[PDB]
Amino acid sequence: RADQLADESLESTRRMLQLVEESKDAGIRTLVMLDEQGEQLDRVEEGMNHINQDMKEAEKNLKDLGKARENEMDENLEQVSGIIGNLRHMALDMGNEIDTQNRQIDRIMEKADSNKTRIDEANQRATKMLG
Amino acid sequence: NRRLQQTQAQVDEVVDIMRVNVDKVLERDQKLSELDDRADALQAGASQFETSAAKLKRKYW
Amino acid sequence: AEAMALLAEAERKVKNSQSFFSGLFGGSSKIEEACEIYARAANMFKMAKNWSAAGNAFCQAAQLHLQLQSKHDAATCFVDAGNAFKKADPQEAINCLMRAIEIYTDMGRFTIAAKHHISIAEIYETELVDVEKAIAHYEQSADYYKGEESNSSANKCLLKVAGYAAQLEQYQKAIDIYEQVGTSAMDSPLLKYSAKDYFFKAALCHFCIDMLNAKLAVQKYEELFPAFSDSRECKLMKKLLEAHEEQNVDSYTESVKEYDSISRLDQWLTTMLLRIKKTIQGDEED
Amino acid sequence: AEAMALLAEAERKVKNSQSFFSGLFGGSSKIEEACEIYARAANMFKMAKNWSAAGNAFCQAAQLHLQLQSKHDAATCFVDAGNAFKKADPQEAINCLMRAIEIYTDMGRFTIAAKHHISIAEIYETELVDVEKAIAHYEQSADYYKGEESNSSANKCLLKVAGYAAQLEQYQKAIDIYEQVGTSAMDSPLLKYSAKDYFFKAALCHFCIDMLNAKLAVQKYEELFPAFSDSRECKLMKKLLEAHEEQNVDSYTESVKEYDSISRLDQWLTTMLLRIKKTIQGDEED
Amino acid sequence: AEAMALLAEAERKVKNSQSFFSGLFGGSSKIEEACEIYARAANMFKMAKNWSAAGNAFCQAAQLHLQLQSKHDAATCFVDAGNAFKKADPQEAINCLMRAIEIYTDMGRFTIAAKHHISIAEIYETELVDVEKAIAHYEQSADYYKGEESNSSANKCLLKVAGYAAQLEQYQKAIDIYEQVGTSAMDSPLLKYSAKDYFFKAALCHFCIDMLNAKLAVQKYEELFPAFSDSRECKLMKKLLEAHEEQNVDSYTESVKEYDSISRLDQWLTTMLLRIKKTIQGDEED
Amino acid sequence: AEAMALLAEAERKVKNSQSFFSGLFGGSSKIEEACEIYARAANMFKMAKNWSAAGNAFCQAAQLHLQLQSKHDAATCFVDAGNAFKKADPQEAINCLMRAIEIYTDMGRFTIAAKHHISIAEIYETELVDVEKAIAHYEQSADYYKGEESNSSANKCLLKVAGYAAQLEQYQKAIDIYEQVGTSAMDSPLLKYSAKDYFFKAALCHFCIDMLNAKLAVQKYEELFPAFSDSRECKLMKKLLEAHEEQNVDSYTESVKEYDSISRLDQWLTTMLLRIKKTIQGDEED
Amino acid sequence: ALSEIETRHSEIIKLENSIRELHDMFMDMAMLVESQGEMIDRIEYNVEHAVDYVERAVSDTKKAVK
Q1: Can chain F be said to touch chain C, i.e. do they have 3 or more Cβ pairs within 8 angstroms?
Q2: Which residue ranges does the record assign to the t-SNARE coiled-coil homology domain (chain G)?
Q3: DSSP label at F265?
Q4: E111, E194, E228 ranked by CB distance to A28: nearest
Q5: With b meaning 16 or more CB within 10 Å and e meaning fewer, what string describes G36-57?
């Protein structure tokens, strides 16, 4: 048991790597997207802004027209440590991308709604002058 | 030796980092989930405006 | 370019025209122009780093927009004004936001009303230090979020409420909130791991009870000796409950010293821990 | 702006015009005006947290919207009504949602139809406790997700289907679902990762077979000892199969006690494991 | 409400009006009416799970839409039809997509064009099993992504290109891609750690070169000893480079067996490693 | 079909109408028509990866789009042009972007202006190698982000500013930025982990000081050795502060060697540590 | 010294434990973020396209007054 633990747990330290390494792989796909999506939402936000503009004009037109075993076991830890730093790297990129976009969602939701109203009002004045 | 009894918290601390990382992302899911029902539903009304604006074109233009 | 010139023209145009100017129609088209003017001014006032001017300017464009009937985009302007005063030097940061919510709310827009509602309680706390009003907002806002089924968001707000509820001596009312947010976070296996801290806080918050409650809540909690995360929740609590029931202000302040290694204590914990450490002494020397 | 007053006037205008009122044109807008009224009512009903009334109000504005020809924004209203009743104290949350899907479905919006379809099967279970219909919904819904390329969601629902299927005696149908969701997961080398647990559940689910359906299912499972994820799926299973295919009831009950360390046993696993612990004993005085 | 009926009416209206029925103004509205018809049909064909019919129906509404002069919303339909045929039983899945890209591409929409371009190369591989055509698409698509300053996406595609390029036979053309995707990865500290596997793959890929392209590629790599991420990359490579430069198919196959402990090998690696194993055996009884 | 043909038609129509041809309304429909033409051409140019032609074409359409009177859509077109030129053959990538911000900024759109502003400073460094002009942008942009209360992004920029400020000998101006970004980071318990590196950088940046500018900054840093995260921050620093106060270019050069084990040094640290390494030597033989 | 060798193991496992679970989170993570990634691919679609529907409307309205 004594050795079945100083080695088995040692295998866990070795595994402790792929465990925190597979996490990076899982983090990459996330970050890679969070970044890709970040730029996407930029062109997406343009939509809420593009519509925000046109609607103003559209409304006006509708208004104008409407009217050594332990030595290694100690090293593996250092390995985990070096990787722990990485976990911080992603934790920040993921964090700064989350907070920057959440607030972006706010602006999107705002303008989107603001324009929704203009569409409804215009749709109630246009539907009548149909055909 | 001591590194073992020590490094133990070097991860228990990260276990907390992800605990928030898993939550942060999930919080965005709901923010984007609702935005998915108000943004898509938004253009839905735009479709009504596209049809209305198209007809006002075949009568006054 | 010249804000001091735009503001002037701005007022010179925002006025119900008459005589030959009014003709047959007049109002909306004009007042809107002024709104755009003041926005244009407030912008350069923002780059100029005047802020105060920018804020009051947005307030002008905002108020004006209402005189044209457009509560929507108007309220969003009030948001701009709030953002201005916020990162500015004068006050009014709270007023603009109140003028924003009074609009979004009555308009049937609770999804966004809560969005600025939390920002509000956040300013009313971090700045005004008006906790009594902040809690009222964090709460009502959480109710709105809970209506949209935006669970997580609502929980964020609830956590704020309870968290600042224990600081205002409201310990019992805090544990109750932790109970609610705990029962509405188990069905989701994405909050399992997190439900711990809740039980830890709730067990820590003491309304000066002299018996179980915490010893009962720690029991209600589901743990297994091989648990990893659970080690950062009740395992500590038990030891604290024993150091309390035995009025030993030496075993409590010691175990907290050990726990401050595997899981560092945040400001909150420290504050409450010291309060409990004092309750022990206030029972010893009594 | 009295609620019940709005509810009255809304009724005053929600009706085919006639006499001098009808005049020249009809009133396709009248019905819309009424819808806006009831919405204004449900607004303040949701204000005083009277939800019940708010929901019943939205039901009205929604029903009326249909009588106008506008299924879209109507169905969305049915959703508002559902969210209301749901968070509210009465029922109706089930009716509103059904009346919502019939619209998102006939119209052509299966994406959102399934979005509410899962909410439905989730309520018909956690509330009404009607699994026989819940599973039916979890399934049809997963079908819709599986047609929107959205693999993840599809599997999300399938897991529910099989999950609650084995908890109803449908053990075999469960393993089959696990096989399907297991095959439609390998195509994506990003799911290789979760594709374990499926084999574990499927191997655990037993329809009282006398052969080695499980010893075979664990065999089909590709694993490598140095691997980790895998050690959290079949490894235990093998030991469980030996304790079962060998008729021993200490090694199984103790192996389930050991695995509970490296990997915490959720509710599901527990219940089923006990069922097997009993197939052992049941096999015992047999 | 019958699809079969709608498909007929649509036809009756989709046709350049002739004789008096035409007059002066064409049928730009009629063609649109037909589009709406077929759309409604494809719609109920999708609820019936008749997929085939749904897809062909969308194809009809789409083609007609083109005959109306509206490439945008047309292409959108082409996509809908693709999503249908894909999760269906007939073909056309590849055709609809190509017919969608020709539109997004000539319309000024490359972002979405590439979005469907990768979907295409993904189907032409996971279905048609046409690797050579799929690579061509993964490549041309990565060009567009990389143009939309979406380096992230660009590499996501390049990895596919090289990945399957080493599987076909193109080992060299693979390493070149790994070199490019490797140089354009360091500019982002968010891919440093991942930039290892790239060097591992590129060093593994061999186009039957006699020099030390690998011994050079491994040297180009920057590693030390206290690095643990790097431990899963070149450290092994060197051992493999020595086992190859010593025609010892017993030291190479032993080292792969050891490395397969600390870092589980995937299908790709396995196949290539064996290829290198045969080049060695093939150098020994040689 | 061909772009070369479109560019031609677009040119023959992008001419302000006068005399009889102008009639009552020359209209901007012509200039806009040409804009659509050039856009259609620039895209197919982006297909054949002609880039140069694509970019210049977009510049044409955008330029005309200004003559149209619609600064907005034009601005984003300039962005399209920038997206082309950036990943192209010629330059202009810097021009288009400047021509875009001059529009977003004056239009009152700082939110997006900063979005492209950072991209700008990101190119003016990794390409033009014009740090002095890059920092100015990273900074002004951070000012905008900070104006939009977007703390996260603002810090993303500040880190860049100070990060490259220390490279340009601006050490004190760097530490100040680190101190600010450090104080405005504690108020947020979601940055605690990162707040270390800040103190490490600031304690490393030295404006030729000889006192305890860092020995005081290391004290201000609340730490507890068995924290690890912190070990990757001040520990080394302390050992560096002793090696400098003793003109030891051996203990410092050894400490950098040892520390480069548990936590690798990035290019930044390398360059600075070397500068500090020289401040010791030059002090020895002085 | 046995005592230290046994106490060592005790702390090592308690460490090994906390580790394995943290790994469990990323697994679920990659399954969540991706499930959300597809929920955005349609957004970008419905957005830049809605810009086309609105653009076509605002254009027709203008040419309906001049």
Answers
A1: yes
A2: 2-64
A3: P
A4: E194
A5: bbebbeebbbbbbbbbbbbbbb
